[PDB]
Design an enzyme around this catalytic site. Structure first.
Site, mmCIF file in Angstrom:
data_model
loop_
_atom_site.group_PDB
_atom_site.id
_atom_site.type_symbol
_atom_site.label_atom_id
_atom_site.label_comp_id
_atom_site.label_asym_id
_atom_site.label_seq_id
_atom_site.Cartn_x
_atom_site.Cartn_y
_atom_site.Cartn_z
ATOM 1 N N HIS A 122 43.550 -65.268 14.776
ATOM 2 C CA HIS A 122 44.715 -66.228 14.674
ATOM 3 C C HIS A 122 44.647 -67.315 15.763
ATOM 4 C CE1 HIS A 122 46.549 -63.535 12.144
ATOM 5 N NE2 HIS A 122 47.904 -64.111 12.050
ATOM 6 N N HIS A 157 46.813 -58.248 20.236
ATOM 7 C CA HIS A 157 45.582 -58.899 20.589
ATOM 8 C C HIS A 157 45.865 -59.059 22.441
ATOM 9 C CE1 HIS A 157 43.529 -60.240 17.279
ATOM 10 N NE2 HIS A 157 44.717 -61.058 16.841
#
Length: 201
Positions: free
Chosen positions: A121, A171
């Site tokens: 992303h 993440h």
């Protein structure tokens, strides 16, 4: 150019540094510290923000913008945007499967199955939104007096997408920085290419 070389060198340094216990320890502490500021209303806001970096959102976004540009100016630059996006996705997948970093898995709020480094992303956003900014400023004359503000928005969106991946617990900060650096690298390459082939300045 020093900008793309510097981003590349930075990525290499990160790819080595994530194998040190000291960085792994800082990454875990920041990931867990982010949980401390969570609120259920903010979880929803952050989940909406994260969708701005998802491939399933950016691909139609690119196509719609590219189509709009074709009808407005007869330009085919939309294919260039698709090409850099495709290169971004392929590069992220190859690197993920080569480095094989395990996800944080302390407190995820969205489900992802793949390895975590580099963050998809963050790489998507840091490439696509600056690229959109470049071609919108290139082709829409009524934006040429807002050039800086257009790039500021792109940068804000990209940064928020990255923040949301850490906030949402899928993440590490270092996955996000690695993705940022390579997405920005690809932006600068396409921008340099497109400016190069111009026949008038």
């Amino acid at each position: 150019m020093y900008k793309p070389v510097s981003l590349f060198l930075f990525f290499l340094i990160l790819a080595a540094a994530i194998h040190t216990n000291a960085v792994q320890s800082a990454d875990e502490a920041i990931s867990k510290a982010a949980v401390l500021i969570r609120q259920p209303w903010l979880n929803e806001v952050m989940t909406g923000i994260t969708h701005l970096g998802a491939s399933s959102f950016l691909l139609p976004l690119i196509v719609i913008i590219g189509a709009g540009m074709f009808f407005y100016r007869k330009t085919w630059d939309g294919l260039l945007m698709l090409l850099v996006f495709g290169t971004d996705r392929l590069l992220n997948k190859v690197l993920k499967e080569w480095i094989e970093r395990v996800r944080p898995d302390f407190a995820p709020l969205v489900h992802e199955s793949s390895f975590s480094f580099p963050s998809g992303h963050s790489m998507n956003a840091a490439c696509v939104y600056p690229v959109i900014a470049y071609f919108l400023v290139k082709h829409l004359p009524f934006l040429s007096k807002h050039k800086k503000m257009v790039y500021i928005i792109a940068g804000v969106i990209a940064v928020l997408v990255g923040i949301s991946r850490v906030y949402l617990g899928v993440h590490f900060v270092t996955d996000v920085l690695g993705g940022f650096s390579l997405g920005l690298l690809l932006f600068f390459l396409v921008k340099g290419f497109d400016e190069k082939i111009k026949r008038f300045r």
